[PDB]
Short mmCIF file of all heavy atoms in Angstrom, two decimals:
data_model
loop_
_atom_site.label_atom_id
_atom_site.label_comp_id
_atom_site.label_asym_id
_atom_site.label_seq_id
_atom_site.Cartn_x
_atom_site.Cartn_y
_atom_site.Cartn_z
N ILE M 253 -36.70 133.10 32.55
CA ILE M 253 -36.96 131.80 33.22
C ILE M 253 -38.53 131.68 33.30
O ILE M 253 -39.08 132.64 33.86
CB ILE M 253 -36.37 131.72 34.55
CG1 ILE M 253 -34.81 131.51 34.49
CG2 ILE M 253 -36.99 130.63 35.33
CD1 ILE M 253 -34.09 131.12 35.65
N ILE M 254 -39.08 130.63 32.90
CA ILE M 254 -40.45 130.41 32.84
C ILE M 254 -40.85 129.12 33.77
O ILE M 254 -40.25 128.07 33.54
CB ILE M 254 -41.08 130.24 31.54
CG1 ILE M 254 -40.56 131.27 30.50
CG2 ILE M 254 -42.55 130.37 31.44
CD1 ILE M 254 -40.79 131.01 29.10
N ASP M 255 -41.65 129.26 34.77
CA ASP M 255 -42.20 128.17 35.57
C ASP M 255 -43.63 128.45 35.86
O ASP M 255 -44.30 129.18 35.29
CB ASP M 255 -41.35 128.12 36.88
CG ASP M 255 -41.27 129.47 37.62
OD1 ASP M 255 -41.79 130.48 37.04
OD2 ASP M 255 -40.51 129.60 38.53
N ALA M 256 -44.06 127.65 36.89
CA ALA M 256 -45.57 127.62 37.12
C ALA M 256 -45.97 129.06 37.52
O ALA M 256 -47.24 129.36 37.41
CB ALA M 256 -45.81 126.63 38.18
N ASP M 257 -45.13 129.84 38.08
CA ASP M 257 -45.43 131.16 38.44
C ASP M 257 -45.37 132.26 37.46
O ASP M 257 -45.79 133.36 37.60
CB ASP M 257 -44.56 131.68 39.76
CG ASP M 257 -44.69 130.82 40.97
OD1 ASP M 257 -45.86 130.37 41.15
OD2 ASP M 257 -43.80 130.63 41.76
N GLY M 258 -45.05 131.75 36.24
CA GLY M 258 -44.97 132.80 35.10
C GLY M 258 -43.57 132.83 34.51
O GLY M 258 -42.68 132.05 34.79
N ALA M 259 -43.31 133.92 33.86
CA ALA M 259 -42.10 134.24 33.16
C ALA M 259 -41.39 135.42 33.78
O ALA M 259 -42.07 136.52 33.78
CB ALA M 259 -42.22 134.30 31.73
N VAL M 260 -40.25 135.32 34.15
CA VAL M 260 -39.48 136.41 34.76
C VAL M 260 -38.19 136.66 34.07
O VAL M 260 -37.44 135.69 33.71
CB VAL M 260 -39.36 136.26 36.27
CG1 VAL M 260 -40.68 136.16 36.84
CG2 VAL M 260 -38.50 135.01 36.50
N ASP M 261 -37.70 137.92 33.99
CA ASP M 261 -36.43 138.30 33.49
C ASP M 261 -35.40 138.01 34.59
O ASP M 261 -35.50 138.50 35.71
CB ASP M 261 -36.33 139.68 33.04
CG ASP M 261 -37.02 139.93 31.72
OD1 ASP M 261 -36.53 139.41 30.64
OD2 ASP M 261 -37.99 140.75 31.64
N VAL M 262 -34.30 137.28 34.27
CA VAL M 262 -33.29 136.86 35.25
C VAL M 262 -32.52 138.29 35.51
O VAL M 262 -32.08 138.86 34.44
CB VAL M 262 -32.29 135.93 34.68
CG1 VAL M 262 -31.32 135.53 35.69
CG2 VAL M 262 -33.23 134.57 34.37
N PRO M 263 -32.22 138.70 36.68
CA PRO M 263 -31.47 139.79 36.96
C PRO M 263 -30.08 139.85 36.51
O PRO M 263 -29.44 138.64 36.40
CB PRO M 263 -31.50 139.94 38.54
CG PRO M 263 -31.78 138.60 38.98
CD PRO M 263 -32.62 137.99 37.99
N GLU M 264 -29.43 140.90 36.12
CA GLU M 264 -28.05 140.96 35.46
C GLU M 264 -27.07 140.45 36.45
O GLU M 264 -26.03 139.87 36.03
CB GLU M 264 -27.72 142.31 34.93
CG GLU M 264 -26.24 142.59 34.68
CD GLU M 264 -26.09 144.00 34.28
OE1 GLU M 264 -26.82 144.82 34.48
OE2 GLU M 264 -24.85 144.22 33.67
#
Side-chain angles (χ1 to χ4, degrees):
Chain M
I253 288 188
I254 317 168
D255 49 3
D257 291 331
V260 298
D261 283 297
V262 185
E264 164 183 17

